[PDB]
Write a protein that binds this ligand. Structure first.
Ligand SMILES: CC(C)=CCC/C(C)=C/CC/C(C)=C/CC/C(C)=C/Cc1cc(C(=O)O)cc(O)c1O
Length: 351
């Protein structure tokens, strides 16, 4: 089926063109907004989008990633050597983790800044063997809200499965985070993230990290995650959520990445074909995909955001509004598009 492969090419090329044109003056990828507060993310989004595009074999994409890495090196204002949501935010383990994946793609894992950043990641390792997003002193020093002045930050500064999964993509950390990632798997075979509504994100990344480890003992856990991924994907080739009952592009893209970890099962191959089919049909004329990268802001004290039923979408809230207990999305559609195009490139050869 050469027409379906040619459409994947045309779809991927349209998405890459959108992403390259979507960069700002300096050349940053920007997405998400905390209006009249944390403002727009760059360091994080650029680190993620750069890592997503690393799978492309194009020379002009690699040039964009080398510029992305140069822009990150210039962000050297934090004494830890970490990267944050944007300039004004303190360093976090997730951003730093994604920046180190981009570093590896541009052959800069051995660089001074990469070594300093990897060293800083080690401080975020918790007793239970997981990675915490924030150090309490850093995030408290930034936050200047009266309501959250002397509240607990053990939610934001506790070990997170979503961040631990992403950081475990780094070979230096995969072995240390292994045991934490194994015990945090649910009976249904999936994982649950802290900052993300869609479990497919954390499930795909954890399974990929375990797969990269190459340990036979982890294969049953991977196969149980794939089986869960197959249940989540409906016959029409999309992941249905409460928000998007006719399919989330973000969740489906990550589910498609999860299903690449089984390459023998005929039913899994058929599901991937269905997922590619739907994603191709959903792509907008400008090459982007409709924003569905839902980032939630738990209360600083909340360790269990998956047990928080009061989630509201920040932009739909009538009246004066706080970010705590609210969900924000990628308004530029750069985070979503980067996720989808990455999944389509990795999935194309397994048709
Ligand atoms: C971990 C990840 C998925 C990506 C790595 C990048 C991260 C850290 C993504 C998470 C989302 C968060 C919380 C990012 C920091 C920004 C912030 C502390 C937002 C809340 C807030 C701010 C302010 C304020 O700016 O003053 C006032 C608030 O009331 C308020 O809730």
């Amino acid at each position: 089926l050469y027409p379906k492969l040619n459409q994947l090419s045309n779809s991927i090329n349209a998405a890459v063109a959108f992403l390259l044109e979507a960069r700002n003056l300096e050349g940053w990828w920007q997405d998400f907004n905390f209006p009249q507060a944390a403002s727009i993310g760059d360091e994080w989004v650029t680190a993620y989008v750069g890592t997503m595009l690393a799978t492309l074999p194009y020379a002009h994409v690699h040039e964009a990633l080398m510029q992305a890495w140069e822009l990150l090196k210039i962000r050297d204002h934090r004494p830890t050597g970490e990267w944050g949501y944007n300039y004004i935010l303190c360093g976090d383990a997730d951003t730093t983790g994604w920046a180190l994946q981009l570093a590896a793609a541009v052959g800069a894992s051995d660089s001074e800044r990469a070594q300093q950043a990897r060293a800083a990641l080690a401080t975020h390792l918790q007793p239970n063997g997981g990675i915490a997003t924030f150090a309490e002193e850093s995030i408290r020093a930034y936050i200047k809200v009266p309501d959250l002045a002397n509240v607990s930050f053990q939610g934001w500064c506790g070990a997170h499965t979503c961040v631990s999964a992403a950081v475990a993509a780094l070979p230096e950390f995969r072995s240390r985070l292994h045991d934490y990632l194994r015990v945090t798997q649910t009976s249904q075979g999936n994982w649950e993230g802290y900052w993300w509504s869609d479990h497919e994100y954390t499930t795909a990344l954890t399974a990929e990290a375990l797969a990269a480890g190459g340990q036979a003992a982890d294969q049953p856990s991977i196969e149980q995650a794939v089986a869960w991924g197959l249940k989540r994907l409906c016959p029409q080739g999309f992941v249905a959520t409460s928000k998007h009952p006719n399919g989330s592009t973000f969740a489906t893209a990550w589910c498609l990445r999860l299903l690449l970890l089984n390459t023998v099962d005929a039913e899994v191959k058929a599901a991937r074909a269905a997922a590619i089919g739907w994603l191709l049909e959903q792509q907008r004329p400008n090459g982007s995909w409709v924003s569905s990268a839902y980032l939630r802001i738990p209360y600083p004290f909340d360790r269990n955001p998956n047990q928080f039923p009061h989630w509201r979408y920040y932009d739909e809230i009538e009246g004066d509004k706080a970010f705590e207990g609210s969900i924000i999305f990628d308004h530029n559609s750069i985070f979503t598009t980067a996720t989808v195009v990455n999944s389509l490139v990795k999935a194309a050869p397994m048709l």
